[PDB]
Amino acid sequence: GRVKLPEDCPQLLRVDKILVPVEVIKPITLKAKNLPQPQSGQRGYECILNIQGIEQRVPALRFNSSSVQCQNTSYSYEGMEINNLPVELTVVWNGHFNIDNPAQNKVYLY
Amino acid sequence: PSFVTFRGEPAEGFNHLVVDERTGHIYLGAVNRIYKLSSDLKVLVTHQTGPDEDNPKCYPPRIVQTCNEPLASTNNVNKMLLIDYKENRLIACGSLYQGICKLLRLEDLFKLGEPFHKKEHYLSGVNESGSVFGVIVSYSNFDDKLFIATAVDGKPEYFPTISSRKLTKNSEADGMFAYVFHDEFVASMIKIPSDTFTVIPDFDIYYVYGFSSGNFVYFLTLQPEMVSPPGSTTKEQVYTSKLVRLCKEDTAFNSYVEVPIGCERNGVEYRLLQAAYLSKAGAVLGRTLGVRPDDDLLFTVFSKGQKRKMKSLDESALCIFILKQINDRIKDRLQSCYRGEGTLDLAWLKVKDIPCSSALLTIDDNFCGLDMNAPLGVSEMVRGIPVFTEDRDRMTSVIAYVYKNHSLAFVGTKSGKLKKIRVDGPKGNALQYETVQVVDSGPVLRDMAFSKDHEQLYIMSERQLTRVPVESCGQYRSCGECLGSGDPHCGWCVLHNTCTRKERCERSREPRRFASEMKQCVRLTVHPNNISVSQYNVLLVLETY
């Protein structure tokens, strides 16, 4: 569990842009590094999308120290105002613990 | 004196217990909890496996996919527990996940991994504790695996009752619980056929005990009414207790064998296995038994009749099987099939009876099984040698060990008592003592293990674990009394003037230092036996032998 070096820290690595169509059931695979294995008394991972219209909480599975995936779900925003809406996403585990997002990767709902 | 114990730390529940050979630390499986305890039964660490929102009906549990059925916080029962020394961890398989298994680190109980994603990662819907068993066998790398049997609950498509699975080094690895050899045609697993389910609705295999011997793996199982008892249509279910075996080496699963097992006492039938324990005889039992030092033995416990596996009868009997004898029965059976005589006769597996094919073969104990005359059953039920029978209070569990060549047997009771039995068919006698370390009102569980040092015997109850010492000879004050009691553990440590076991007496090995029989005591005589009150300071001579 100890982190002496900055390279080793828990963070989400970027992949080709995450495209998400509205009203489509799709999984969102993620890559990352040094994801912790939840210890006793600690719950699993969730994907939180910060959409002003609706914030979605989808639970996810941590396959290994470097990969995650939100489960099949569909997303939407109300308005039909703009085609491409980038959304900040926060990966959390054990409820509150937010994993660091240096790149600040976002999900594009189109 | 009081016995050291661990109360249900969760006062709430308890299910399985195991001891680490090196450390002596005791790991205890329970509902919603897995505990690590010291030899003394002090609480080392508590793990929360428990209450998870879930539903038994749902296939791939909520995490993988959405389930229409409503969820409720439910209890996760520890179905199984197995120590993986090589991996330096503990496999603690639960339920309520569709039976997902967990890996806890040996020292701290840190969760190394718990594979949920694939179908193999799910063992069984079954909520019941102890209905599952298995063995972990390991070798150096590029040689290895886990054999596990579990009940299906009528899930035949989802899970295999018996399987040969993979245990990768990395707990994170996806590969875990994958079948050793998977082929489109045949996989290292045995499923229950759908046809058999339709015929008998409820059929299910419950695995009580399991152990590795030589180079095989045996399981004591309970099954349903299939040609026993005869019945045209479904109605009542009665069970038949049988022995199962596999070659460790058979990826194909061709080696499967299944013999019904039981024993009878004066015209009374004891068909249902409560528990079993593989062990050694030691010089005493082995000699009269006619065995080699290495040869194994299997102590077992059976209830009377075929009825009510859920709640069996009080009448119970402790029987015995010599592995050589069972091996013979199996070899005898195989050499017969190879004769081409009769059918395979395994009702649940093969509905339509296929015939045995004759062939030229050298039939040995090594025989792993062949493509033709494939998995087969057995006609002649193997009878066991009876030892002790309790009518009033049902035996629940058993263990045994070698002490100074004498074979001591331990038997749990429905009452919460342990019996210390010297088996003396090969010698000559019966039950030496009974103890209530445990729990005066209500019973003991099959997981009953002796410590590594073999000083104590941890006895598990639904509520508590109790460290019952294997002898309490100290109660006896004199050589006459000590040897008088007869409980075989006790001897008179002459110089110490105390009553205890051979191990306890320092220098007992030396001559006349320790007394086994009353004759050895002590005999004393005084020459002036009678002396008058008037006399004083008279010389007396003492003769002692």
Residue numbers in the entry:
A (entry chain A): 692 to 801
B (entry chain A): 37 to 581
Quote the paper.
Class A plexins (PlxnAs) act as semaphorin receptors and control diverse aspects of nervous system development and plasticity, ranging from axon guidance and neuron migration to synaptic organization. Plexins are large type 1 transmembrane proteins comprising typically ten domains in their extracellular segment, a single membrane spanning region that is predicted to be helical and a conserved, cytoplasmic region that contains a GTPase-activating protein (GAP) domain with a Rho GTPase-binding domain insert. All our PlxnA ectodomain structures show autoinhibitory, intermolecular “head-to-stalk” (domain 1 to domain 4-5) interactions, which are confirmed by biophysical assays, live cell fluorescence microscopy, and cell-based and neuronal growth cone collapse assays.
In five out of 13 full extracellular structures all ten domains are resolved whereas in the other eight structures some of the C-terminal domains were not modeled due to fragmentary or absent electron density. Some flexibility in the stalk is evident on comparison of the 13 different structures and contributes to the ring diameter ranging from 84 Å to 99 Å. This interface is formed by blades 1–3 of the sema domain of one plexin molecule and the outer side of domains 4-5 (PSI2-IPT2) from the ring of a second plexin. Superposition of the crystal structure for a full-length PlxnA extracellular segment onto our previously reported Sema6Aecto–PlxnA21-4 complex (Janssen et al., 2010) brings the two IPT6 domains into close proximity. The distances between the two PlxnA ectodomain C-termini in these modeled complexes range from 10 Å to 59 Å for the five PlxnA crystal structures that have all ten domains resolved.
